[PDB]
Amino acid sequence: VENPSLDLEQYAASYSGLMRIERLQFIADHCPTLRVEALKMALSFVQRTFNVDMYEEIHRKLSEATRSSLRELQNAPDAIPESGVEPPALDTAWVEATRKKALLKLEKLDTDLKNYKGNSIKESIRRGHDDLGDHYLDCGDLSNALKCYSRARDYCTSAKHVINMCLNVIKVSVYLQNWSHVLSYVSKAESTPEIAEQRGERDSQTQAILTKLKCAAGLAELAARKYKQAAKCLLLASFDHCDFPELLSPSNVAIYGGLCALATFDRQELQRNVISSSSFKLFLELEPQVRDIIFKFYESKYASCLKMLDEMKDNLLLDMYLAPHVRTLYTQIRNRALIQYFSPYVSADMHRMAAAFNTTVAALEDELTQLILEGLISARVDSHSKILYARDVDQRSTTFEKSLLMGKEFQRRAKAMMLRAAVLRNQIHVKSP
């Protein structure tokens, strides 16, 4: 469910434009306690660079949370914004002021763009394309933002111009649900600078370039239900960028890569990927709650590793992209921990497994039914003694019969091929239709 304890300062200062507003509205619609602070910080962003599409949608949720008596927000707001803070309201003289001010800024930037083209300066044209691309995003023109970034590709002359241009197309391709275009642009941005310049950004590095190309591709791979490819590229990034102005927060890459590799890899693969690599150690050291999961999974401590998983589920559900992935990734981690636990055993007791997973005898019997059809193990449930036994066939029975069935189809398909080639000799083709 929702969680009242959540830092909204870091979750809002990581992205900008439409991503900052959409990330704040999903928290207020899911968490009733974090609804006033979520709508107040989202309304403050509309003051800078006014618009008309995102100014009428935020106020629609504020009127349904204060005037309606069906929610808990009634004793404090009293159906009026005059309650402690003073968020920007919506009246008659406000829908017109938010449209005339936004149009005035568009005429000033469009007039200056025509003057920069006549001066034959490729530096003034590329700089003006970034200001026009981010202006059409908050207004509502999703198609006009891609036309400004596409025209700046012909004004490049350095390696920094290609990286800054390719990063802008990814932001527009996210709203359009174009996951195939993001994977096709991260490869071009990695061959031009030859991975963090040609010497490694002098000696000391403050903002790594490889981290920017590795963090933008992880968001498109996670939404496409590709946990195998997303967990193999997030381990090469290092904690050396100091937050992000328009990307994911550094406190979320450890969870995005830590939860994806926990469902596709076993215990031996985790000690060589997320442990042996020194690049992923800097991201796991910031959040100690994620590093203890790998250690508890290797020491055969499935009892304490499961209780810590549900404790952080309430905080991850408040997100926008990780929320729909709580029903597909959680079922795979629990299924993977049960297969690795039954590998050394062969006759596990139902009374001992029910007390280890903090369950009961009624819930343990239902878990064994979904572990044989979905899992890759081979166990037998003996209801006469409530003991998970094991009854497997002989190795020579499943091998001689499988090879004999394939040999019969091999001779049948070979003899049937001669019948098809027999009519093709005496000039007899297809004459049925």
């Binding site: 000696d203 000391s204 020194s278 150690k281």
Partner: protein, 51 residues
């Protein structure tokens, strides 16, 4: 290629390692180890090299 015994750029970084180890800060110890490879390629074998 004459007399040795006298390094300042590596002595400052070596003094921060003995202090950061008491606070258990692996984020700063990893950055100081990469900067010590450039100085190691220009010094003989004194005492700071072993630190």
């Amino acid at each position: 290629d004459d007399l040795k015994k006298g390094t300042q750029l590596l002595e400052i970084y070596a003094l921060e390692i003995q202090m950061y180890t008491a606070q258990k800060n692996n984020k700063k110890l990893k950055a100081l180890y990469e900067q010590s490879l450039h100085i190691k390629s220009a010094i003989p074998h004194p005492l700071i090299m072993g630190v």
